[PDB]
Design a protein around this ligand. Sequence first.
Ligand code: CLA
Ligand code: CLA
Ligand code: CLA
Ligand code: CLA
Ligand code: CLA
Ligand code: CLA
Ligand SMILES: CC(=O)O[C@H]1CC(C)(C)C(=C=C/C(C)=C/C=C/C(C)=C/C=C/C=C(C)/C=C/C=C(\C)C(=O)C[C@@]23O[C@]2(C)C[C@@H](O)CC3(C)C)[C@](C)(O)C1
Ligand SMILES: CC(=O)O[C@H]1CC(C)(C)C(=C=C/C(C)=C/C=C/C(C)=C/C=C/C=C(C)/C=C/C=C(\C)C(=O)C[C@@]23O[C@]2(C)C[C@@H](O)CC3(C)C)[C@](C)(O)C1
Ligand SMILES: [Ca+2]
Ligand SMILES: [Ca+2]
Ligand SMILES: [Ca+2]
Ligand SMILES: [Ca+2]
Lengths: 166, 166
Amino acid sequence: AFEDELGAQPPLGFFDPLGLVADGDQEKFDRLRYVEIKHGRISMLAVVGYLVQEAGVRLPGTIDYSGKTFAEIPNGFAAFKEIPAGGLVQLLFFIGVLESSVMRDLTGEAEFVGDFRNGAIDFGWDTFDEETQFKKRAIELNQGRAAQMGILALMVHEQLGVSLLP
Amino acid sequence: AFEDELGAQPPLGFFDPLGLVADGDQEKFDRLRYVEIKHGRISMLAVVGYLVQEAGVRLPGTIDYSGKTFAEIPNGFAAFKEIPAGGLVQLLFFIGVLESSVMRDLTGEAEFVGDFRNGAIDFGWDTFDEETQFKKRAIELNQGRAAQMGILALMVHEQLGVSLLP
Ligand code: CLA
Ligand code: CLA
Ligand code: CLA
Ligand code: CLA
Ligand code: CLA
Ligand code: CLA
Ligand SMILES: CC(=O)O[C@H]1CC(C)(C)C(=C=C/C(C)=C/C=C/C(C)=C/C=C/C=C(C)/C=C/C=C(\C)C(=O)C[C@@]23O[C@]2(C)C[C@@H](O)CC3(C)C)[C@](C)(O)C1
Ligand SMILES: CC(=O)O[C@H]1CC(C)(C)C(=C=C/C(C)=C/C=C/C(C)=C/C=C/C=C(C)/C=C/C=C(\C)C(=O)C[C@@]23O[C@]2(C)C[C@@H](O)CC3(C)C)[C@](C)(O)C1
Ligand SMILES: [Ca+2]
Ligand SMILES: [Ca+2]
Ligand SMILES: [Ca+2]
Ligand SMILES: [Ca+2]
């Protein structure tokens, strides 16, 4: 059914040990694929952010008018103890607004799930041939899969207190 | 242009002292009307909630597993000092999900701005005749306008420390 879909590749081939898409429902597959791409994009950004922040890189100066500095804010979950309440509200709200109003198929012209270009932002999708376009989608998906496991590893081991970083 | 639209009624008639819709742009009017209905629905719920909560009505029992009781939580802005962080996150998140996925025209079948029935929930809109339907929309809008001023009054006077309630 979906043995030929994007994401079935060497060395495992089509890999669905829980038969989640064995029923051949295209809409179920389309949703799960949407969810898989989304977790992957978030996790790709999350691993880079965790590593950059772990290395001590900080925005210059202060995060609020009381004089709280980005430099005082630690990496990991501990960051949330030191970001001011108003900043946490804004971060959650403005990610929510991406979810409600931006990062979605607004016009119905998406070529496949995860295509949010919306006839608005495009760096040249059609300059890739069909094989290259498929390759780029596969890289996006599989980098996303690897990063999902990577960010889970970093979050878990932060709590374990067994570091995975030099 | 919009002198005959919903919301222009006695005693003021069409009332736009800032000429915001003087340009006759239907899409600008449609947006502003959408925003006016939305503030009004929120404010209608807000005034009732503030008054019910001010009267001391509380949900039974505890709001978290640490034993924090609804009864310990005060009315007004002070409530946010005592709702646990996890509850504040959930409240904001689940209102955001209403915004991203529920309280909007998902199907394009809305009869006018603010119609979120979505072919899914309808208690009998078409059992009203056209005059009654217009009357009900006018009540919804003007109750919303009154409640906007009412909730602003209550929030402002809470901070003034000059109570408007017996
Ligand atoms: C207020 C902000 C906001 C809003 C309004 C939304 C709105 C939405 N998001 Mg988004 N999201 C946000 C912030 C927000 N998001 C943030 C900050 C992140 C992190 C960057 C994400 C990451 C995210 C992902 C990864 C996904 C969504 C999805 C969704 C949609 C479904 C939400 C749902 O059904 O409830 C949620 C319902 C639940 C039952 C919650 C599920 C909890 C998951 C399965 C496990 C989480 C584990 C937890 C974090 C750790 C446990 C603790 C541990 C000790 C055990 C909706 C469009 C989903 C989507 O698009 O579906 C098609 C989806 O897959 N969002
Ligand atoms: C994470 C949760 C979440 C998410 C994702 C959204 C998402 C959205 N909301 Mg919603 N909303 C939420 C929570 C959320 N809302 C909550 C909790 C409430 C209260 C119940 C509302 C009430 C609300 C209203 C009333 C309106 C929206 C609107 C919108 C849309 C536009 C948002 C925007 O452009 O940025 C916001 C951009 C800004 C520049 C912020 C404007 C700030 C306003 C003008 C003044 C606020 C004054 C402030 C509270 C008090 C000042 C302090 C004082 C001491 C001076 C978008 C669909 C708007 C909409 O549908 O537009 C068509 C709209 O009119 N929302
Ligand atoms: C939320 C994340 C998410 C989602 C929705 C999907 C969804 C999908 N994947 Mg994918 N995948 C993911 C993460 C995800 N994957 C990660 C992180 C990896 C790397 C390990 C992969 C690697 C992968 C391969 C190699 C293949 C798929 C395939 C598929 C498709 C069919 C199989 C299936 O149902 O999924 C998998 C299972 C689920 C979505 C069920 C969720 C798991 C439950 C709810 C909790 C389990 C938590 C788990 C124990 C965490 C520990 C990790 C483990 C290694 C110990 C479907 C579109 C196949 C495909 O593309 O077919 C065309 C395919 O060949 N996936
Ligand atoms: C999962 C992604 C993610 C999350 C949730 C966070 C969360 C956080 N970061 Mg981090 N960060 C990330 C990725 C992430 N970061 C990446 C990829 C980088 C490298 C550029 C950084 C670099 C960075 C620095 C240097 C600092 C933080 C800081 C912080 C904290 C305060 C908020 C802030 O200043 O943000 C700042 C956020 C950035 C500088 C980059 C965010 C990039 C986002 C994820 C882009 C993604 C969405 C985008 C709109 C997509 C547009 C597409 C387009 C086509 C329209 C907070 C814990 C500050 C702190 O206190 O650290 C402890 C701080 O000093 N971050
Ligand atoms: C966010 C709330 C909001 C929004 C978007 C609108 C939008 C609209 N109203 Mg409405 N209205 C509101 C709140 C709102 N109203 C409230 C609270 C009341 C009761 C006082 C009314 C009473 C009202 C009447 C009687 C009429 C309208 C009309 C209209 C339409 C054209 C006039 C206009 O541009 O609006 C008004 C102005 C604005 C949206 C600009 C915003 C104001 C700025 C940004 C800040 C001002 C803050 C202010 C000082 C707070 C103090 C309150 C004041 C009494 C001291 C338009 C659809 C007319 C109509 O329906 O035409 C068909 C009409 O006849 N409105
Ligand atoms: C603007 C609306 C609004 C807001 C933001 C709040 C916010 C709050 N309320 Mg209040 N409340 C409201 C309206 C509101 N309330 C109304 C209308 C009532 C009467 C039913 C109450 C009755 C009430 C009680 C009895 C208690 C609170 C409490 C609380 C606090 C903790 C959260 C909680 O337990 O919620 C509980 C919320 C409710 C019991 C009712 C919320 C009704 C919402 C607004 C319905 C609106 C959306 C809905 C999904 C629309 C569906 C449409 C459909 C066609 C699909 C928090 C400060 C608790 C607290 O600590 O107080 C200090 C508490 O004990 N509220
Ligand atoms: C123009 C503008 O304004 O914006 C534009 C700019 C531009 C460029 C055009 C755009 C784009 C494309 C973007 C942003 C592409 C981003 C790509 C990105 C960010 C890709 C990350 C992959 C990470 C992986 C695979 C990690 C696996 C991690 C794994 C498997 C781990 O184990 C983690 C690890 O830690 C452990 C657990 C232990 C450590 O011992 C070792 C390591 C570190 C390995 C956008 C989207 O259009 C927006
Ligand atoms: C089936 C289900 O599951 O749900 C369904 C149920 C049902 C019923 C079918 C549905 C509905 C309809 C609903 C929920 C309708 C709600 C209507 C509602 C809640 C209407 C409030 C008006 C408030 C106004 C005008 C306040 C002005 C307030 C003013 C002008 C003030 O000055 C405030 C005031 O405080 C001052 C400042 C000083 C005080 O001295 C005096 C007072 C108090 C006056 C939904 C939506 O379909 C959902
Ligand atoms: Ca300091
Ligand atoms: Ca610190
Ligand atoms: Ca107690
Ligand atoms: Ca208390």
